[PDB]
Amino acid sequence: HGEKSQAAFMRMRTIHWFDLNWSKDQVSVNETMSISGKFHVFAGWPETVDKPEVAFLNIGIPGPVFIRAGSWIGGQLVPRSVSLELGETYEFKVLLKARRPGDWHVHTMMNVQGGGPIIGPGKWVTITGSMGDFKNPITTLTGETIDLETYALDGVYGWHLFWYLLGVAWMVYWCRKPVFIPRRIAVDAGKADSLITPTDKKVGMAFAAGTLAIVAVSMGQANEKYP
Amino acid sequence: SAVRSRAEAVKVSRTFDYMILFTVFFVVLGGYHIHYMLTGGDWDFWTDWKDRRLWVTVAPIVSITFPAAVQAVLWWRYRIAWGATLCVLGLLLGEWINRYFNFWGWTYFPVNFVFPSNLMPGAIVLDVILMLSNSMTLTAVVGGLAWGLLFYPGNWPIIAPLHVPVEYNGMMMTLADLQGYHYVRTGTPEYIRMVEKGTLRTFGKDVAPVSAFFSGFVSILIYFLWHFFGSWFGSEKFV
Amino acid sequence: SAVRSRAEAVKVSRTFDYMILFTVFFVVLGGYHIHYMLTGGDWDFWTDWKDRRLWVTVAPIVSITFPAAVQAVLWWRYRIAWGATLCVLGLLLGEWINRYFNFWGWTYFPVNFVFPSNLMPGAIVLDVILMLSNSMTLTAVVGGLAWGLLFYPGNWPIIAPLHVPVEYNGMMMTLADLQGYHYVRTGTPEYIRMVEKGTLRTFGKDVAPVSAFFSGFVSILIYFLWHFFGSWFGSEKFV
Amino acid sequence: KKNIIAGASLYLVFYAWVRWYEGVYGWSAGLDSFAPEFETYWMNFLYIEMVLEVLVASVLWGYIWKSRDRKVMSITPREELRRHFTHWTWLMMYGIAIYFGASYFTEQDGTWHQTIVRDTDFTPSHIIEFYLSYPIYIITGGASFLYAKTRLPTYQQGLSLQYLVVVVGPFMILPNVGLNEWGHTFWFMEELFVAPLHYGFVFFGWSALGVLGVINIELGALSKLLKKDLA
Amino acid sequence: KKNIIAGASLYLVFYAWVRWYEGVYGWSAGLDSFAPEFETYWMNFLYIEMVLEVLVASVLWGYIWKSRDRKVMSITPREELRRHFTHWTWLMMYGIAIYFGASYFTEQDGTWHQTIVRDTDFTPSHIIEFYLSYPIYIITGGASFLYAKTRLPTYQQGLSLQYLVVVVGPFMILPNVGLNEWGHTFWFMEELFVAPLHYGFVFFGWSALGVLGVINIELGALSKLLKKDLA
Amino acid sequence: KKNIIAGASLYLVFYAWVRWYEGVYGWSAGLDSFAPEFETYWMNFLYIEMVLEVLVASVLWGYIWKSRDRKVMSITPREELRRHFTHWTWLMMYGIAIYFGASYFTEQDGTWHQTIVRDTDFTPSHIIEFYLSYPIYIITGGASFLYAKTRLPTYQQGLSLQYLVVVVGPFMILPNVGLNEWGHTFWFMEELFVAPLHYGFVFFGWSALGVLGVINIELGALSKLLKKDLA
């Protein structure tokens, strides 16, 4: 969508996408479509754009409306970055899974480290259905088939909520006591020991010990639950 | 003298306290959040950036800045025990609001992909180490080492489920890598990912602990510097 | 007391003023010219270096240094309204003498190829913004933005005639590029030319304005720093 | 001497309006700079907000007209005590504004940069962040500073230094927007963090720690307005 | 108490002699280090100028021999007023020397590289720049400093700090010539400006701002020698 | 008031023991991390030394138990003069320890790194340097500092600043061992010197110049304990 703002000469002397084929233009949630074709790296590369030693075959869309179920360059899956040579031609293919309803302009792009986004032609694809139906099943090397859309979420929520409530309780222990004004006057007069009583310092130890304890038990429990 | 009673002054103090706390909380939240989200927060944005070398090294270092500065006057002026806890509570609240209402609510990245880092443990231990020992250099050293070392252990129980290996179309990937692969980030190519990649001078499994000790050592100096920086921010000079 | 009359003191003051002005003019000229001609002056030497990104970014930044320093005592000691004008007059005189008598008179580079940059506008606006508002931070901010923004507009009427396109032996070139091509600079190959070359993150036509705003923002900090630097140079301490 | 304009913080309703206007009129109606739909819902927005902000800043900053003899330190804990409450209402407003400007919309723009929009030549996310939220909190901070300057005795002694930092300090991120969009262009780095181009207005959040000095000051003339009435 | 050696500024005639000697005996007779024509018109030049400069500096700096009881602050505006005029004559000479050394010949050397002469192992616009003009203005500055030290009462209190900067400061570009010719060799950069190798004696032009301190001093004991006679 | 524990510097015998244990049990019996011979002569060494050092530091640092009323400045040159001699015995011990830790074994580890042992995951040379010598001199320095703090009147005024530098300063190279082994891993450089990774604990040898301050102090209360008896 933002290709229109890139330097005209850059758009013309970098990468040329041809033989492009979109397998569909009307998908429903959980359905897949593919984009195939070839691209030719121009030997007269721009000086200010680093040569593509490190490139990544990306997809141009407004957030994960699709999910990149796979992507191949010359027949190999390319989840990592790759290397290209000036003047070569490559065959590529991308497999998308519809996730969010709407109408989206789907572009094929190549990120070049030290360069930038190199956006290919876009196509209008329509997704129909309800996002609540999206499923992303996965089987692990333990199998253990899970749903990557919501897997491990309760753990994140629980742990973050617990630590937050612990930190709130620390402040609350000191919030009931009048703060600011009496404390200022105290240290100004020379009573620096305002509310740091022995009982107030032993509460600090409990928190510090209860903390250093929970971390260790939690590390052990994690190592035992996910060997 | 002209209010009403001496108990009226207690109520006036209480109301002032609630206002001052509000304003400090939110102003420090703004500043801290911008500093964090612009020095070490790409690792904070995505789970597939929370690696063993650069995340564990950068998060605590840049995170210990504001806690130390705010502590330089919320301790020697009002003996306030919290102040690092308050900084971290603000940072976490801001980050969670943004992740849930913009990252997920606006662009629809799944929440289990963009949740924030956990910095509550180190904060509490730092506050306590300062309450006891009432020392800036003692706290500097010990609390810096703790801050640096408690980070990865404090986060592991949260990201462990996403480190289960998976074979995807012939390549081996963790669930976090699979997330980073599925949910397209048109603005974040894979090669910018600054994560541990292994070297000839690296050992097979020693990144997490070494990066947590290096981070603790550097947090020592960071706390040292920002203690004085915060002491300056507390100045009442007029020009 | 032993001179002659009270009008004799007025004449003694006048003669002293003429001497002091001479010496300040020329010493500051020397220092300013060396600083400029050794930080940002390749863009100043050749017309085919006066581009839209690096020239507009560097010239004003490094140029605002001496004006600010000299202003730190030629304002709070003698309320002298000029001082940036004097710095710029000296710089321009030195540069023009050198260009006309050495660049052209010695090596025979045509004058329409090596004329200097124009820094008179920003200087006058800075001097005025300081005379009114008598503030160093107000002047810092506003005059820095002005200095940064008035540069390219102040120079365009001079270099515009040399930006007419031309087709030379099949390639398209501006008259400035053609000059740089014709008049051999054995010591200045073409590749060292640090000019805007376009990028994938650059927009079609946005260099000049963006580089003038970035330059203004950085000139803010530069003026800030050199105000204090100049206040130090004004010290009367003895050791 | 409060519980009035403190509860009248319309910041929420106004900001709750843009977060809605964002997710409804800038999702796809603002994805392309194009020419029609964009200059209708986003460029007019920009122009209107710039003019309104300039005029509102010029107007609201008239505490120099309401300023007069401010020897309230000679007054009892009634007139001066009442002014400090107003000052802290102003400061709470400033805190809300700083939160929404430096935390909510800044990290929202961070989110936006990741999904699709390459900063090339523009974004609609920092039409609301750089040109709406930053000037808003700048106006609020200037208002609070001027109020203290013109209405509290302890501030009649020449421009508290730290108050200038929790103020114009955070102002220096606005002009800092020149660093970015120039560090994003010819010096780009498609991140928020490793790119030192952003370290410009990282040297602005620090300045937002000048509320350690305003608090020390406002708790030194106020500690002497409560000492006698201890219990 | 002036209008004598001030008009006797032979700096012009002497410098007008080298600018002529340059454009007549170094254009092609000095293009090649070779062996005969170069060591005849340019190496002998170098040796002669070095020895003459060392000896002239050792001699001219004898204001410590003419120095004595300098309580001219106890004298009226006649003897001390007359000395300040001599000091400012010295300072005008120093200004001329600094102009010719740091501005004229420095940028002339800048012109020379851009044409042909790669600095490799030498340049004849270097005999004229680093070994003639810099020592000349160094001698003049030292002379002026010593004069003030030995002849004006206000300077009897221990080496004004800023006077040392508008002096030895600009001296530190001479030894700085080691940075260049080493930053031009194994660290080279065929420019004046981006090459940080030149930033060495960029930290010398700044030092040439110590004439802000000498002027403040010389306008503080002189303001008290003119106060009574206002009109 | 000396010539007792000064000559009882067992540092030599102990260090002469490790230099022997090194060249006899770590030459080939410690070349490979392997599993048996290494964890027998080098890992047990490490564990034993760590525990012994922690416990010896906790114990030896009990000069706060022997501390009491230290107004020895009111005493004659007999009791306080005798304490200064003990302080300087402690300081001589600290000097020996610092020599062996920062000079002998550090450059010995430098030698080791050159021959074979790539630092990858470990070395037996800095089992003796980082975990034996550094903690030893740390213990000695802390002991000396505490002694002065608890036994000399001139030190009862709050923690001499420079004494803290010739102390915890040199302590900051121990945690600095995190910089190296991280700058040697993912940032490696197979040298001691150009690699800025080592510049961490280059900013530790400097701190070992705090013995310029302890000497100034100990020669200011001692100069007043010898003034009367000049000849």
Ligand SMILES: CCCCCC(=O)OC[C@@H](COP(=O)([O-])OCC[N+](C)(C)C)OC(=O)CCCCC
């Ligand atoms: C600021 C702190 C912050 C964090 C972030 C950063 O800085 O980043 C990371 C690194 C760097 O990167 P670059 O890319 O630029 O470079 C290359 C890589 N290496 C590894 C080789 C280095 O850094 C780190 O790590 C951090 C540190 C800091 C200082 C000490």
Ligand SMILES: CCCCCC(=O)OC[C@@H](COP(=O)([O-])OCC[N+](C)(C)C)OC(=O)CCCCC
């Ligand atoms: C000093 C100021 C001065 C100016 C000049 C300079 O510096 O130069 C320019 C740039 C740099 O260059 P280099 O070649 O080195 O590098 C590369 C390029 N880039 C673009 C990538 C960076 O810089 C600039 O621009 C300036 C700035 C400054 C600081 C802020």
Ligand SMILES: CCCCCC(=O)OC[C@H](COP(=O)(O)OCC[N+](C)(C)C)OC(=O)CCCCC
């Ligand atoms: C509060 C002490 C808890 C110690 C937990 C631990 O040893 O974790 C080791 C882990 C290293 O993980 P790794 O070497 O991969 O082996 C552990 C295997 N996993 C990662 C699966 C748990 O990295 C860290 O957490 C550094 C923290 C050091 C604190 C002193």
Ligand SMILES: CCCCCC(=O)OC[C@H](COP(=O)(O)OCC[N+](C)(C)C)OC(=O)CCCCC
């Ligand atoms: C980069 C860290 C510098 C911090 C130095 C500092 O604490 O300030 C001391 C100085 C004034 O020193 P002094 O008059 O001794 O007053 C010390 C008390 N405070 C700390 C409140 C200014 O204050 C300033 O001018 C601000 C420093 C620059 C901004 C980072």
Ligand SMILES: CCCCCC(=O)OC[C@H](COP(=O)(O)OCC[N+](C)(C)C)OC(=O)CCCCC
């Ligand atoms: C980049 C960090 C800025 C640190 C500011 C600093 O330490 O400088 C203190 C300086 C000390 O000189 P100052 O007190 O301004 O001069 C005396 C002012 N009067 C004449 C009113 C007494 O005052 C100012 O900087 C002016 C305010 C700057 C606001 C950002």
Ligand SMILES: CCCCCC(=O)OC[C@H](COP(=O)(O)OCC[N+](C)(C)C)OC(=O)CCCCC
């Ligand atoms: C005093 C305001 C004058 C404004 C002139 C102007 O807008 O110039 C735009 C020019 C941009 O040139 P460009 O985008 O190429 O479009 C103008 C076409 N030319 C270069 C042929 C005049 O870049 C600048 O001069 C930056 C100055 C900003 C001052 C607020």
Ligand SMILES: CCCCCC(=O)OC[C@H](COP(=O)(O)OCC[N+](C)(C)C)OC(=O)CCCCC
């Ligand atoms: C890199 C900028 C540093 C400028 C600091 C400055 O103004 O000097 C303060 C200091 C003395 O501070 P103070 O005794 O407070 O006297 C302030 C008055 N002036 C500015 C005339 C020295 O003077 C120096 O030792 C010279 C600074 C190093 C050369 C760049």
Ligand SMILES: CCCCCC(=O)OC[C@H](COP(=O)(O)OCC[N+](C)(C)C)OC(=O)CCCCC
């Ligand atoms: C690289 C910047 C140099 C900045 C010089 C500075 O700030 O240091 C001040 C220092 C302050 O100590 P000072 O006043 O020399 O010691 C007292 C001198 N007496 C004993 C005569 C009172 O004096 C000097 O630096 C010596 C002169 C250097 C000339 C370039």
Ligand SMILES: CCCCCC(=O)OC[C@H](COP(=O)(O)OCC[N+](C)(C)C)OC(=O)CCCCC
């Ligand atoms: C963006 C609204 C923020 C609310 C600010 C606020 O609550 O402060 C109350 C303050 C009123 O404080 P007060 O003590 O009434 O003013 C000082 C007393 N006077 C004005 C009579 C000298 O308002 C003003 O001073 C002017 C308000 C103009 C914008 C709505």
Ligand SMILES: CCCCCC(=O)OC[C@H](COP(=O)(O)OCC[N+](C)(C)C)OC(=O)CCCCC
């Ligand atoms: C204080 C910033 C001035 C913004 C002026 C404006 O309304 O933007 C129009 C113009 C942009 O015009 P242009 O891109 O040629 O065409 C505008 C139409 N769209 C939005 C489709 C690209 O902006 C500029 O002068 C350059 C950017 C400001 C400096 C950071």
Ligand SMILES: CCCCCC(=O)OC[C@H](COP(=O)(O)OCC[N+](C)(C)C)OC(=O)CCCCC
């Ligand atoms: C390179 C020539 C620059 C001209 C210097 C000048 O005009 O200063 C006049 C000054 C004369 O000043 P005046 O007040 O005569 O000397 C102080 C009074 N005395 C010497 C009797 C103590 O000369 C000297 O002190 C010695 C000159 C030697 C080189 C030509």
Ligand SMILES: CCCCCC(=O)OC[C@H](COP(=O)(O)OCC[N+](C)(C)C)OC(=O)CCCCC
């Ligand atoms: C203080 C500098 C000493 C200059 C000594 C001299 O007269 O130059 C002769 C010699 C150069 O001799 P060389 O190049 O072997 O042969 C001279 C004959 N030409 C001029 C034909 C190369 O210079 C050097 O010792 C090296 C350069 C000085 C250090 C910056």
Ligand SMILES: CCCCCC(=O)OC[C@H](COP(=O)(O)OCC[N+](C)(C)C)OC(=O)CCCCC
């Ligand atoms: C690693 C051995 C270094 C030898 C230290 C030394 O010679 O100091 C003597 C000092 C004795 O100094 P002295 O003046 O006897 O102690 C102060 C006097 N008292 C203890 C009675 C208050 O010893 C102590 O204070 C405690 C020794 C424990 C480790 C062996």
Ligand SMILES: CCCCCC(=O)OC[C@H](COP(=O)(O)OCC[N+](C)(C)C)OC(=O)CCCCC
């Ligand atoms: C304070 C450092 C803790 C050293 C703990 C220890 O005894 O080392 C065992 C373990 C190393 O175990 P590993 O390499 O898996 O196997 C040890 C067996 N060898 C020696 C054959 C490699 O060390 C670590 O935790 C990492 C290094 C410390 C941080 C700088």
Ligand SMILES: CCCCCCCCCC
């Ligand atoms: C009184 C302490 C001096 C002010 C703090 C300056 C510290 C700067 C270096 C860490």
Ligand SMILES: CCCCCCCCCC
């Ligand atoms: C009185 C002001 C202190 C001297 C100026 C130092 C400023 C240095 C940082 C900009």
